[PDB]
């Protein structure tokens, strides 16, 4: 009989979801990108429940932010005002 099902991997398998930064290089010198994941008012680094990043890229962003802050590329206690008008990628609203 030819009608029997055949062993096979799911062809309808949807691709696994990817974070916004997947495949992209995160550099401590790219302060513009790093500033998109810190609080505008306190400079505190957002958690992954806000940034939506995967664990690997969350760690990469955290390390890059600390490196840039200590090496004299990024402010610590606030987000640099030059980057306040960049696209908002974090799921947080201060009702400001």
């Amino acid at each position: 009989n030819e009608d029997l099902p055949i062993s096979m991997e799911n062809p309808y398998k949807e691709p696994l979801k990817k974070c916004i930064l997947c495949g992209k290089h995160v550099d401590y010198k790219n302060v513009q990108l790093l500033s998109q994941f810190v609080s505008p008012f306190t400079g505190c680094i957002y958690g992954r429940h806000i940034t939506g990043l995967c664990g690997k890229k969350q760690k990469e962003i955290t390390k890059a932010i600390k490196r840039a802050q200590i090496m004299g590329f990024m402010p610590v206690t606030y987000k640099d005002p030059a980057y306040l008008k960049d696209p908002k990628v974090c799921n947080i609203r201060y009702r400001e």
């Binding site: 009989n1 009608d3 029997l4 099902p5 309808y12």
Partner: protein, 98 residues
């Protein structure tokens, strides 16, 4: 003599593939106030709210267009060894089948 394997292979439900975001025709078979129970040929019916636009046309036997999301709504919860089912399909009511 057609075997069960051939029936399953050439069945429309088998041919449809994944049920997510598929347009189907359903038939209203029961109405409870503003809740319409619709069969679209699956194991379970789907229950939809009567639209506010031309709501009077939705009567028993009426043919409607649905966008399927799930053939059956199930989910496993904390501390359970088996899924919990509501015995209902998930669908979006689009309109009447002209």
């Amino acid at each position: 003599v057609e075997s069960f394997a051939s029936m399953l292979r050439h069945s429309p439900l088998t041919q449809m593939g994944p049920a997510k975001d598929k347009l189907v025709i359903g038939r209203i078979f029961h109405i409870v106030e503003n809740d319409l129970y619709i069969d679209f040929g699956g194991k379970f019916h789907c229950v939809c709210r009567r639209p506010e636009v031309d709501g009077e046309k939705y009567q028993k036997g009426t043919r409607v267009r649905l966008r399927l999301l799930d053939l059956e709504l199930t989910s496993r919860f904390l501390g359970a060894t088996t899924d919990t089912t509501v015995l209902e399909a998930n669908a979006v009511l689009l309109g009447i089948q002209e």
